[PDB]
């Protein structure tokens, strides 16, 4: 408990608890670099994966599912013409929650969306609802493999429908609130990662609408979920940050400092800053630092006098002082605050 | 010897396993379990030499440790677990359910069954007695001790056991005209209806059996297993229907 | 040209793989390297080369044909989990473990058997004695 399995034994096979698998699991399909069957296609992604799964999986449910839909997926026009029946069967069989057949069905659902992206939008609401019920169902029978399949299916859909979902990112977030706010820590954590991919793909203008909505929700566990969402979006690789991180922080910082936003939002930004401060090295934080200082200088006002202080206190404290580049800037800043509050802060 | 043996020579192994004589020097010794050594099929032989799912002993061990194999609804991890007659072997990953029934040749056959049929098994009542506190019980051929049995159940009758609960759902009396499966001797694997039971006090009883093809043969009562009423067996039978 | 055909294909979800008999027809060639066959079965089944293993190739008398066994695992992780260590070493997926010969290890085992406990007390006792 106190110490994780940092030192590995010489054994080739080792027992791993369900919780242990979940902690290591991370939803980011693009990170995986194993060959994907759907990369090679003759007719459509669905058929390519559908043929493969027929030959690997032998479960009772999947075999029955294949028989119904085998005749209607031979050609892409056939899939498009029969899209309605295919989706209903996929949802119907996923509802059975049979672990022996979830993996092919869930994979095909994602690839189904791949074949007809814009036309899958009318199916978008029902697909997410079915996954949410499955994941909520997944809690009672412990299988880390099921969670990986379900969220990877969710991540794939976002990848294929990235353009359309981004335009209405708040709507996609609204569906996943029960997951992001769920009692279990890891369900919110996983759902945050899947939605984080959309966030980093969001235009700045659309992002400002998205951040306003989520902060408006803040005023159970939604606070923790959002913290994972934003920090995951900013973090890209060890000791480094995503290129969009600077744009996200500026959008986040502006909304938090705005008087309309609740104080809880500023606390989130404080928590978001602390996480990225450790994850990133000195160099990757320089662009992020500059936007904070400029925005603080530009938006310093009596109404937001406290809030700029609360964030600034987080900056000086984070990892002690090692991550802050050049400190005259804070001294120049703190002079401005006193020139323009809460004594305790 | 100064104790129980722990090795088995391939030439000494039961013939009906059909083990290659040149593959090695030793054969799997069945561990203690429900079925006797000579009338059992260890899981390693079944998984490797019959289904061919595993190519070597280590692969069979790996399969078992994954807990993919269930015997009579219970997970078994012993490579040499002695599965035997009327045993239900379930592989969920392959969606396969097997019942171990000898063929006309006299060897265990790879007989696939449905889930509904796999939900139960048949047991020959080897003994009926009162236990402690005056609780009646029946001991079957597979070593199952079942308490509170039906009073009508006697020795040599067949009880239908539900695997999930291990209780008696129904039973079939030993009587003339009942359908019978031979589990011993040269007539092993044949199926026929009883005609007469010759009873010799202090000796082995003999049963005359008549096949569908009108042929008759006599077998010791110990090799007899009642499986249902004529033309209406309670278990799916293998190909050939125990003829010849 | 050179042809490969897979026959007797059995899906084995127990070990999470596909096992088959590989027949390679190679007119006007000595024989075909295992690595090429791994690459090409990988391309065929749309799986990683790391997930494909082949063994037991015997050229038919007179040449022109070879027959052996092949395995294609559902994932490279599954192959690393279930494959024999020596086969993993052949394909480079695993590193050969360096160990002393059997005689040396057995002699060391006997010598360690003769000594009881850690032995540092014996060391200090002999150091004092001499």
């Amino acid at each position: 408990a106190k110490q994780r399995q940092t030192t590995k034994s010489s054994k080739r096979y080792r027992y791993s608890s369900f919780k242990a698998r979940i902690d290591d699991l991370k939803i980011e399909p693009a990170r995986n670099l194993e060959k994907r069957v759907h990369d090679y296609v003759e007719s459509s992604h669905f058929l390519a994966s559908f043929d493969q799964w027929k030959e690997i999986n032998l479960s009772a449910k999947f075999t029955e599912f294949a028989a119904e839909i085998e005749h209607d997926v031979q050609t892409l026009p056939q899939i498009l013409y029969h899209d309605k029946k295919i989706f209903n069967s996929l949802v119907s069989f996923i509802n059975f929650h049979d672990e022996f057949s979830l993996q092919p069905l869930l994979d095909l659902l994602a690839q189904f969306c791949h074949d007809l992206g814009p036309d899958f939008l009318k199916f978008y609401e029902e697909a997410i609802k079915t996954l949410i019920n499955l994941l909520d169902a997944a809690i009672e029978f412990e299988s880390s493999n099921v969670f990986e399949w379900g969220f990877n299916c969710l991540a794939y859909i976002f990848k294929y429908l990235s353009k359309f979902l981004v335009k209405k990112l708040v709507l996609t977030c609204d569906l996943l609130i029960p997951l992001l706010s769920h009692s279990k820590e890891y369900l919110s954590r996983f759902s945050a990662e899947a939605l984080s991919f959309l966030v980093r793909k969001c235009p700045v203008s659309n992002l400002r609408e998205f951040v306003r909505s989520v902060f408006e929700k803040l005023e159970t566990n939604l606070y923790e979920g959002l913290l994972i969402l934003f920090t995951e979006s900013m973090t890209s690789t060890q000791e480094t940050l995503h290129s969009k991180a600077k744009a996200i922080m500026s959008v986040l910082l502006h909304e938090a400092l705005t008087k309309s936003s609740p104080e809880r939002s500023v606390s989130l930004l404080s928590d978001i800053w602390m996480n990225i401060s450790k994850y990133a090295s000195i160099e990757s934080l320089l662009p992020v630092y500059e936007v904070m200082y400029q925005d603080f200088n530009d938006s310093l006002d009596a109404t937001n006098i406290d809030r700029i202080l609360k964030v600034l206190t987080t900056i000086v404290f984070s990892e002690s002082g090692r991550k802050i580049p050049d400190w005259n800037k804070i001294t120049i800043l703190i002079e401005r605050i006193m020139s323009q509050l809460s004594q305790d802060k | 010897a100064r104790g129980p043996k722990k090795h088995l020579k391939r030439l000494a192994a039961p013939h009906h396993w059909l083990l290659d004589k040149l593959s090695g020097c030793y054969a799997p010794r069945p561990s203690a379990g429900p079925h006797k050594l000579r009338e059992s099929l260890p899981l390693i032989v079944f998984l490797r030499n019959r289904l061919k799912y595993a190519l070597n002993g280590r692969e069979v061990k790996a399969i078992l440790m994954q807990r993919h194999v269930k015997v009579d609804g219970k997970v078994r991890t012993d490579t040499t677990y002695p599965a035997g007659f009327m045993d239900v072997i379930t592989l969920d990953a392959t969606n396969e359910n097997f019942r171990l029934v000898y063929d006309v040749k006299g060897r265990f056959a790879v007989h696939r069954i449905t889930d509904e049929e796999a939900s139960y098994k048949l047991g020959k009542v080897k003994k009926v007695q009162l236990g402690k506190k005056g609780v009646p019980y029946v001991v079957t051929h597979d070593g199952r001790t079942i308490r509170y049995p039906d009073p009508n159940i006697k020795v040599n009758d067949t009880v239908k056991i539900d695997l999930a609960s291990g209780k008696i759902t129904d039973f079939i009396k030993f009587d003339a005209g009942k359908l019978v499966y031979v589990t011993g001797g040269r007539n092993l694997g044949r199926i026929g209806t009883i005609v007469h039971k010759e009873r010799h006090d202090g000796g082995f009883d003999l049963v005359h059996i008549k096949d569908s093809l009108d042929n008759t043969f006599v077998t010791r009562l110990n090799n007899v297993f009642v499986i249902g009423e004529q033309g209406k067996p309670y278990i799916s039978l293998p190909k050939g229907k125990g003829i010849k | 040209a050179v042809t490969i055909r897979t026959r007797k294909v059995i899906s084995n979800p127990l070990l999470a793989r596909k096992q088959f008999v590989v027949d390679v027809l190679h007119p006007n060639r000595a024989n075909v390297s295992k690595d090429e066959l791994r690459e090409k079965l990988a391309e065929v089944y749309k799986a990683e080369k790391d997930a494909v293993s082949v063994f037991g190739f015997r050229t038919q008398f007179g040449g022109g044909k070879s027959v052996g066994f092949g395995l294609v695992y559902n994932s490279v992780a599954e192959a690393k989990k279930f494959e024999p260590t020596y086969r993993l070493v052949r394909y480079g997926l695993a590193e050969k473990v360096e160990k002393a010969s059997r005689q040396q290890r057995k002699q060391k085992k006997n010598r360690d058997k003769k000594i009881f406990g850690t032995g540092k007390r014996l060391a200090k006792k002999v150091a004092r004695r001499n």
Partner: peptide, 19 residues
């Protein structure tokens, strides 16, 4: 009761050529 129906093989042979 009837026995379970045999399942047609899921996998089939496959071929290529090179060089």
């Amino acid at each position: 009761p009837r026995a379970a129906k045999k399942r047609r093989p899921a996998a089939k042979g496959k071929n290529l050529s090179f060089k």
